[PDB]
Design a protein around this nucleic acid. Structure first.
Ligand code: DGT
Ligand code: CA
Ligand code: CA
Ligand code: CA
Length: 344
DNA sequence: GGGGGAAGGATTCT
DNA sequence: CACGGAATCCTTCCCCC
């Protein structure tokens, strides 16, 4: 309004909390949601865990085996994505009743442009307690709210107040963070980028202002360059806009690695059958076969057709692209799947 | 010189 | 890496005005 007022909501340890909601008997105990790859007994990884377990180091990304090694007595539940998704949607609807300007950024977070629903942050903070309280009431889900002048800082405000919290980073505090904040804690800055920036001499957002663009561009790319410089100059003002799915796909892990076409197909087709059920009523013009090689490397191959793709065409083309992969790469394949995009 | 795609890879999401 | 999506961006290549 004078400048945006963004309200960001991020659901606390989502998948695990949902499981808690569906079985409150779990509350207070360490809960670990798992992704069993079927390779052996407990092969796989943790999708997420609640804070009770997270304090002992059990968090998203670690092998289930190491999790059990740390907390052999925690409750281990298999991931139930669809259920979580439906719980997510109902909540997104609640939020949708606090602003038409809503951006569902992921399965458990969203930005709300509340510039014309409040003036000054006090009214914002209160509107956050209002929303937090509302959600807790209707779905018994705790969330963390973040408020600031733009999407990035609202999210940062959230990361700082997790879990079940709420924080406001006023315009004056942004100035402090632009200099105080660790560059790696900036959204979109993963380990790889974090490093490329270290070497360059950037450790705080402020530092991107003292380097020459062209150099910074060649090191982390133009897009990421302008992004950081925007935040640095305190000129980041990306608008909140409704995002719509552009891709739908599934990829499974094989019992054993392989390069034998007939051994891989059953998995590939299974991925297709599920990808299709999920496409719902959407018709894709583009298809990509995706394979994870034995050394966790990802190779893909695809084709865009001038028309929509039928299930039959998907089966036939997928086999061709899979062959193109086996043909152009010697590695064994560990995970195989498909991705459909460019919906009509 | 440069628009517009398409394809395959790189990163991020914490 | 010991899942499993999904978005965006980079580089290269291609057709061609
Ligand atoms: N399979 C899989 N799922 C993930 C992964 N990371 C996150 N998810 C899923 C399950 C998480 O509960 C859900 C929400 O992501 P968040 O980063 O907000 O994690 P959580 O919500 O557990 O984090 P938080 O409470 O905000 O610290 O997305 C991952 O690495 N693998
Ligand atoms: Ca989140
Ligand atoms: Ca969360
Ligand atoms: Ca990071």
């Amino acid at each position: 309004h004078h400048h945006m007022i963004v309200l960001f909501v991020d659901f606390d340890y989502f998948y695990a909390q949902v499981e808690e909601v569906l079985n409150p008997s779990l509350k207070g105990k360490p809960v670990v949601v798992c992704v069993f790859s079927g390779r052996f007994e407990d092969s796989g990884a943790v999708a997420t865990a609640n804070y009770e377990a997270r304090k002992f180091g059990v968090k998203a990304g670690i092998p289930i085996v190491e999790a059990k090694k740390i907390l052999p007595n925690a409750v281990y539940l298999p991931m139930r994505k669809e259920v979580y998704q439906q719980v997510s949607s109902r909540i997104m609807n609640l939020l949708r009743e606090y602003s038409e300007k809503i951006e569902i950024a992921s399965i458990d977070e969203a930005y709300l442009d509340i510039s014309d629903k409040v003036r000054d942050y006090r009214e914002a903070y209160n509107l956050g307690l209002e929303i937090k309280n509302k959600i807790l009431e209707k779905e018994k889900i705790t969330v963390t709210v973040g408020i600031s002048k733009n999407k990035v800082f609202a999210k940062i405000a959230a990361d700082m107040a997790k879990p079940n919290g709420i924080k406001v980073i006023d315009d004056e505090e942004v100035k402090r963070l632009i200099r105080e904040l660790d560059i790696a804690d900036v959204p979109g800055i993963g380990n790889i980028t974090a490093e490329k920036l270290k070497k360059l001499g950037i450790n705080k957002l402020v530092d991107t202002l003292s380097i020459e663009f062209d150099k910074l561009k060649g090191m982390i790319g133009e897009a990421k360059a302008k992004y950081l410089i925007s935040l640095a100059r305190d000129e980041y003002n990306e608008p909140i806009r409704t995002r719509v799915r552009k891709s739908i796909g599934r990829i499974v892990t094989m019992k054993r690695n392989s390069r034998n076409l007939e051994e891989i197909k059953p998995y590939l087709f299974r991925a297709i059958e599920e990808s299709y059920y999920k496409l719902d009523k959407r018709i894709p013009k583009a298809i990509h076969v995706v394979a994870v090689t034995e050394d966790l490397d990802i190779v893909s191959r695809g084709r865009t057709f001038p028309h929509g793709i039928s299930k039959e065409t998907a089966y036939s083309e997928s086999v061709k692209l899979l062959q193109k992969i086996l043909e152009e790469d010697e590695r064994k394949i560990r995970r195989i799947g498909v991705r459909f995009s460019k919906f009509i």
